[PDB]
Amino acid sequence: QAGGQKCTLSISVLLAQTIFLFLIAQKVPETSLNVPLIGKYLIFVMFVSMLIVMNCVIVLNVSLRTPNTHSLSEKIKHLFLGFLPAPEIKSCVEACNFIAKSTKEQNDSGSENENWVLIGKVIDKACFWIALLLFSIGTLAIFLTGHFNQVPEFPFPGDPRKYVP
Amino acid sequence: YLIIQRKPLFYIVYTIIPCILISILAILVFYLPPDAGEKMSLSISALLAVTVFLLLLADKVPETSLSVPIIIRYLMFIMILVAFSVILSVVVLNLHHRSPNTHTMPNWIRQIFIETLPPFLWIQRPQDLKEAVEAIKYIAEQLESASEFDDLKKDWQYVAMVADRLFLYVFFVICSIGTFSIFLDASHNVPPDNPFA
Amino acid sequence: IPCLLFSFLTGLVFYLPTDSGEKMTLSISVLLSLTVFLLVIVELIPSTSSAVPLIGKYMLFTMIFVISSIIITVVVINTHHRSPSTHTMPQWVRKIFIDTIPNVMFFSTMKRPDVKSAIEGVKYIAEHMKSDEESSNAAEEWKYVAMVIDHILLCVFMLICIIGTVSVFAGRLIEL
Amino acid sequence: IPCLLFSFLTGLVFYLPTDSGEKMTLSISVLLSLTVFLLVIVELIPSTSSAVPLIGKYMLFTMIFVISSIIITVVVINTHHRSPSTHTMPQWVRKIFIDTIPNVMFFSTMKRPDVKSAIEGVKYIAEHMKSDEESSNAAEEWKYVAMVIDHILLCVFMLICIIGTVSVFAGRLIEL
Amino acid sequence: ESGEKMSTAISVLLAQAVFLLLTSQRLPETALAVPLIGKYLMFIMSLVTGVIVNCGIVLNFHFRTPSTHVLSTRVKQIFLEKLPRILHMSRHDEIKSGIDSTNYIVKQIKEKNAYDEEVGNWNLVGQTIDRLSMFIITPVMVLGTIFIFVMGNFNHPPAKPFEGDPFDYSSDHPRC
Ligand SMILES: *[C@@H]1O[C@H](CO)[C@@H](O[C@@H]2O[C@H](CO)[C@@H](O[C@@H]3O[C@H](CO[C@H]4O[C@H](CO[C@H]5O[C@H](CO)[C@@H](O)[C@H](O)[C@@H]5O)[C@@H](O)[C@H](O)[C@@H]4O)[C@@H](O)[C@H](O)[C@H]3NC(C)=O)[C@H](O)[C@H]2NC(C)=O)[C@H](O)[C@H]1NC(C)=O
Numbered sequence: 001q002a003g004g005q006k007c008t009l010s011i012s013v014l015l016a017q018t019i020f021l022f023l024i025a026q027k028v029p030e031t032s033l034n035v036p037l038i039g040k041y042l043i044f045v046m047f048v049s050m051l052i053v054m055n056c057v058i059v060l061n062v063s064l065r066t067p068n069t070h071s072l073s074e075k076i077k078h079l080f081l082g083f084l085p086a087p088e089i090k091s092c093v094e095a096c097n098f099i100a101k102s103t104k105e106q107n108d109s110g111s112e113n114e115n116w117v118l119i120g121k122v123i124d125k126a127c128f129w130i131a132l133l134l135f136s137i138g139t140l141a142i143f144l145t146g147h148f149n150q151v152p153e154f155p156f157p158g159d160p161r162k163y164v165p
Numbered sequence: 166y167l168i169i170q171r172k173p174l175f176y177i178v179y180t181i182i183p184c185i186l187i188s189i190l191a192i193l194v195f196y197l198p199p200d201a202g203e204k205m206s207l208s209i210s211a212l213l214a215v216t217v218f219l220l221l222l223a224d225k226v227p228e229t230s231l232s233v234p235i236i237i238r239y240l241m242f243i244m245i246l247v248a249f250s251v252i253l254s255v256v257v258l259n260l261h262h263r264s265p266n267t268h269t270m271p272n273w274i275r276q277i278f279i280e281t282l283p284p285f286l287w288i289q290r291p292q293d294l295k296e297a298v299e300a301i302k303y304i305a306e307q308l309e310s311a312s313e314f315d316d317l318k319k320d321w322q323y324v325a326m327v328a329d330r331l332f333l334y335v336f337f338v339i340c341s342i343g344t345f346s347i348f349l350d351a352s353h354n355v356p357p358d359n360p361f362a
Numbered sequence: 363i364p365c366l367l368f369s370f371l372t373g374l375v376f377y378l379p380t381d382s383g384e385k386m387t388l389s390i391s392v393l394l395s396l397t398v399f400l401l402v403i404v405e406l407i408p409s410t411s412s413a414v415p416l417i418g419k420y421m422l423f424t425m426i427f428v429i430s431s432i433i434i435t436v437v438v439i440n441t442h443h444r445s446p447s448t449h450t451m452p453q454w455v456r457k458i459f460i461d462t463i464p465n466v467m468f469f470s471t472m473k474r475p476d477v478k479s480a481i482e483g484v485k486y487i488a489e490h491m492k493s494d495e496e497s498s499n500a501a502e503e504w505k506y507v508a509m510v511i512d513h514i515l516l517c518v519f520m521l522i523c524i525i526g527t528v529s530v531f532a533g534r535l536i537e538l
Numbered sequence: 539i540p541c542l543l544f545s546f547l548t549g550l551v552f553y554l555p556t557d558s559g560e561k562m563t564l565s566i567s568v569l570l571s572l573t574v575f576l577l578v579i580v581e582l583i584p585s586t587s588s589a590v591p592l593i594g595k596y597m598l599f600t601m602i603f604v605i606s607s608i609i610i611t612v613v614v615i616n617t618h619h620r621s622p623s624t625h626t627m628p629q630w631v632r633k634i635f636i637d638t639i640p641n642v643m644f645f646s647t648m649k650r651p652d653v654k655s656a657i658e659g660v661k662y663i664a665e666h667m668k669s670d671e672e673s674s675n676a677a678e679e680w681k682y683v684a685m686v687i688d689h690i691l692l693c694v695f696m697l698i699c700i701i702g703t704v705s706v707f708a709g710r711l712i713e714l
Numbered sequence: 715e716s717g718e719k720m721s722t723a724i725s726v727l728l729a730q731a732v733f734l735l736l737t738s739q740r741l742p743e744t745a746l747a748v749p750l751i752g753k754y755l756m757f758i759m760s761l762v763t764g765v766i767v768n769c770g771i772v773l774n775f776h777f778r779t780p781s782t783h784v785l786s787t788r789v790k791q792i793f794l795e796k797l798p799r800i801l802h803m804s805r806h807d808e809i810k811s812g813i814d815s816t817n818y819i820v821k822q823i824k825e826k827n828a829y830d831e832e833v834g835n836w837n838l839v840g841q842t843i844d845r846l847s848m849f850i851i852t853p854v855m856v857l858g859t860i861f862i863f864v865m866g867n868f869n870h871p872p873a874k875p876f877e878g879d880p881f882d883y884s885s886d887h888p889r890c
């Protein structure tokens with residue numbers, strides 16, 4: 001909702017990743033035979049931030065839905081909220097009952113928006129447990145691959161000699 | 166010997182004019198109402214911009230440590246001024262979003278910011294029937310309670326407005342004085358009339 | 363690849379409802395990221411003026427794409443907060459965006475002494491409630507129009523991104 | 539000095555209320571300023587890998603400071619916008635944050651035929667009003683908890699900034 | 715009503731700062747002239763700073779309330795009556811207790827509606843300031859851009875070197 005600042009955070013992290021890309025481009029060689037690891041990871045995290053911007057936008061769309069724009073169906077709620085987890089007195093009375101009716105209508109619309117909000121929160125928790133795993137696994141795989149890229153034991157693989165004094 | 170005076174038009178444009186504009190922005194943020202929510206954006210974007218100017222200037226300043234050039238002193242002045250603008254905007258927003266449920270207004274704040282300052286700064290501001298009657302009485306009492314709550318909210322928001330205007334005047338004065346004391350210090354650096362050689 | 367990401371996000375802002383005050387945040391931050399990427403492009407790309415490269419055409423394309431997204435985003439946002447007190451919905455607006463288009467939008471999934479003063483005051487409350495409900499229905503019509511335009515432009519911009527990353531990079535890539 | 543300003547400003551988002559939808563703005567913009575300043579630093583200081591200098595230790599301390607600030611800020615926003623319909627406030631949280639810490643402070647300003655239809659409607663209205671009052675009381679308790687947490691973390695982060703600028707720059711400075 | 719005016723404008727100014735950065739590292743630090751591009755950058759950065767000041771004024775006016783400000787008849791005449799027309803803008807103690815209670819409710823509701831009416835008038839004042847600033851600036855922006863860049867595009871060299879020499883110094887037409 002207004003003030004949560006989901007897209008703010010996401011797109012600002014994308015901006016920071018862009019600045020880091022500019023900084024890396026000042027440090028990597030200009031060869032085109034292989035993609036280095038830090039640029040690969042920058043691309044990965046930028047794709048992840050793009051997908052999470054998409055997810056935040058979708059969650060904001062769903063959580064902000066109203067009966068005027070979209071109809072909430074039984075099947076959607078069941079797929080998310082149930083599965084994934086005298087003349088004067090006559091004027092007086094007329095006015096009073098109209099007031100009560102208007103109030104009831106407003107409040108029922110409010111309840112509908114609330115259902116949409118909860119659907120959004122559910123999507124959100126699931127998308128979180130997916131994003132954490134994705135980002136952590138990508139980061140960890142890439143960088144332990146780097147850590148494991150160690151010099152051979154012998155200068156020439158087949159040659160058994162160390163060629164040292 | 167070659168006594169040579171520099172022509173700084175390039176630096177003037179590319180570093181000082183942007184900083185003049187940034188310092189202007191750092192004064193405006195106190196004219197904004199907190200109900201907009203565009204206050205941190207302004208302040209911290211100004212800070213980011215003066216950081217961009219610092220980056221710009223990085224590759225153009227001697228890397229010696231016998232003194233600080235008036236240009237970097239000016240940039241640090243504007244940077245710290247934007248920082249304090251951020252701090253005080255945070256303070257104003259805190260005061261503006263205060264309420265009795267979270268804060269008790271003390272007497273010194275009330276006095277200073279509602280009695281002393283505003284003049285200076287130019288602000289100056291039968292069973293069924295029984296059920297129905299009890300329900301309407303409850304409604305009326307809730308409404309009057311909320312009116313009082315809103316009155317106190319408005320007192321806090323007025324404190325915020327007053328602090329904001331005070332900060333506006335203070336920052337205009339500080340920025341102007343510092344900028345002009347730095348520029349006058351720079352205009353009076355003219356090569357001597359005799360080179361002593 | 364960063365240009366692809368920026369173009370996708372540009373097209374993406376059009377699924378964000380104006381209720382969240384973040385359409386401009388998103389679009390303008392995509393624009394800022396693309397300006398910083400122009401900054402790195404100027405360092406990795408030849409600074410010659412003999413011709414526009416392919417990357418340069420693509421960069422200009424994505425920048426114009428982002429900027430047009432921002433402009434139409436502003437128009438949508440205004441169509442959203444378009445009060446009835448000052449604007450009245452014309453005939454084409456409620457004829458195209460309310461009676462024709464929502465029906466050919468399949469990927470949408472959207473809708474298609476003092477005792478006397480007392481009764482006088484209750485009647486005044488009813489009067490104000492009625493007027494407010496009318497104005498609110500009007501504002502809801504405006505919001506629905508904005509939503510329909512937003513969906514249309516989502517589709518248009520996704521398709522433009524597709525055909526743009528294909529066009530600029532098809533003829534040369536088939537010569538290869 | 540710029541890194542000091544960024545640290546000091548990260549220790550400040552905790553005096554920024556959450557009703558102000560600007561905490562992420564402030565924190566993440568400090569982070570952006572620090573990233574551009576990371577550019578500055580890499581342009582200025584050396585690219586040595588012989589050891590970790592003091593500039594680097596301080597920059598990484600500041601960056602982790604900003605990241606922790608943002609994380610706890612998100613926690614505070616989540617507690618503040620903690621609906622009572624789905625979250626009932628525990629008792630230990632009320633005992634600690636509403637009942638103990640507020641008093642443990644002294645420097646703060648915190649607190650411590652038809653007619654039947656009409657009757658039906660007015661009674662409904664009052665019942666809904668008191669339900670709304672209950673929900674608001676719960677939401678305000680959550681807001682109070684978040685505000686207390688914010689004051690605590692403000693103190694903690696200002697203290698961290700101070701002791702950090704001193705520690706990272708004490709061993710050598712006294713030796714000089 | 716969309717908290718995105720200042721964000722928009724100040725982000726535009728950040729982009730302009732980035733372009734100023736890219737420009738500053740393309741020319742020598744000479745002082746016999748301001749480069750046309752730097753001229754335009756200063757002009758446009760100042761104009762955008764003015765746009766930001768104006769949006770701040772508009773917001774200040776928009777968020778005024780009877781509790782803090784007074785809607786002077788001068789301001790009404792100016793920004794609600796005159797200029798909009800110019801800018802061409804669109805448009806038994808128990809029963810007695812209950813009776814006194816409903817009277818009090820009506821009183822408060824009428825006060826609230828007057829409040830909201832004056833707030834709407836302040837909003838119209840803001841809209842008028844907005845259209846005025848648009849019709850004053852946007853022409854200025856476009857015309858200054860065009861002026862500058864035609865003055866630049868019409869800087870063809872003199873077609874003849876050595877001002878006081880009718881000779882073209884061309885291999886085609888020698889003299890003797
Ligand atoms: C760092 O980089 C260097 C390269 O700059 C790596 O050094 C390479 O290491 C490989 C593995 O240790 C070497 O492979 C071994 O090469 C030798 C020699 O091969 C040469 O001579 C062969 C025989 O020549 C006779 O027979 C031919 C066929 O009948 C005739 O045509 C010829 O006239 C002669 O009569 C020849 O067939 C071959 O093409 C070469 O000219 C082999 O004896 C070993 O069996 C190869 N394998 C092993 C396990 O040694 C490779 O030669 C060597 N290159 C250089 C430039 O020294 C070094 O390993 C890298 N270190 C790393 C990555 O840590």
Ligand SMILES: *[C@@H]1O[C@H](CO)[C@@H](O[C@@H]2O[C@H](CO)[C@@H](O[C@@H]3O[C@H](CO)[C@@H](O)[C@H](O)[C@@H]3O)[C@H](O)[C@H]2NC(C)=O)[C@H](O)[C@H]1NC(C)=O
Nearest residue numbers: 166167168169170171353354355356357358359360361362
């Ligand atoms: C530019 O640099 C040159 C060289 O550094 C400066 O010349 C030197 O100036 C100093 C101070 O005036 C001289 O010292 C004094 O010389 C006078 C001569 O009468 C003597 O009486 C004093 O007791 C003292 O020795 C110095 O001799 C002179 N020469 C050199 C080569 O050092 C010059 O002054 C500088 N110009 C400017 C504008 O600063």
Ligand SMILES: *[C@@H]1O[C@H](CO)[C@@H](O[C@@H]2O[C@H](CO)[C@@H](O[C@@H]3O[C@H](CO)[C@@H](O)[C@H](O)[C@@H]3O)[C@H](O)[C@H]2NC(C)=O)[C@H](O)[C@H]1NC(C)=O
Nearest residue numbers: 869870871872873874875876877878879880881882883884
């Ligand atoms: C390119 O640069 C050359 C110089 O490097 C220019 O030629 C020189 O231009 C100057 C200024 O116009 C001439 O000086 C003038 O001479 C006349 C005649 O004496 C005098 O009346 C003027 O008051 C002025 O002093 C100079 O004679 C001329 N020649 C040289 C070799 O310096 C040339 O004009 C430039 N071309 C262009 C198109 O910019």
Ligand SMILES: CCCCCCCC
Nearest residue numbers: 099484487660816819
């Ligand atoms: C006589 C009943 C008036 C109802 C007022 C409702 C205020 C929310």
